[PDB]
Amino acid sequence: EGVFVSNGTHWFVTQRNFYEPQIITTDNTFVSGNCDVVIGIVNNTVYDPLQPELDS
Amino acid sequence: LQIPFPMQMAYRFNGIGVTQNVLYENQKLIANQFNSAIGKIQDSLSSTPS
Ligand SMILES: *[C@@H]1O[C@H](CO)[C@@H](O)[C@H](O)[C@H]1NC(C)=O
Numbered sequence: 338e339g340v341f342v343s344n345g346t347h348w349f350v351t352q353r354n355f356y357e358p359q360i361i362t363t364d365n366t367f368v369s370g371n372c373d374v375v376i377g378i379v380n381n382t383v384y385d386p387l388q389p390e391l392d393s
Numbered sequence: 394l395q396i397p398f399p400m401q402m403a404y405r406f407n408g409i410g411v412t413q414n415v416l417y418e419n420q421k422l423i424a425n426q427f428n429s430a431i432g433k434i435q436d437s438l439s440s441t442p443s
């Protein structure tokens with residue numbers, strides 16, 4: 338429910354009625370397919386909270 | 394507000410239930426169908442007694 342923007346060096350996800358930068362997590366994105374059929378793919382990282390919060 | 398036309402039609406699909414993955418994986422097919430429809434418009438306006 339957003340659009341992927343980039344201020345030059347970091348990518349984010351904002352709603353398309355107001356600028357609100359948020360980190361690209363596994364909650365505002367859904368996985369569907371592989372990175373070959375899409376036209377316009379960009380390499381980045383999807384920070385998940387599970388692996389960090391599991392470290393104890 | 395400037396916005397790419399593929400992303401524009403991808404956001405236009407999120408009004409009828411269809412997600413963006415469909416348009417982003419069949420962009421060439423959608424473009425070909427739209428071009429074919431635009432081309433057939435003139436052919437089906439050619440005679441068209443009514
Ligand atoms: C873009 O935003 C990030 C926020 O993490 C910041 O660290 C970076 O300096 C910003 N870059 C520019 C060019 O504004």
Ligand SMILES: *[C@@H]1O[C@H](CO)[C@@H](O)[C@H](O)[C@H]1NC(C)=O
Binds near residue numbers: 378
């Ligand atoms: C993304 O990474 C893959 C392999 O890691 C590479 O083949 C591809 O060219 C990269 N694309 C960009 C835009 O960096």
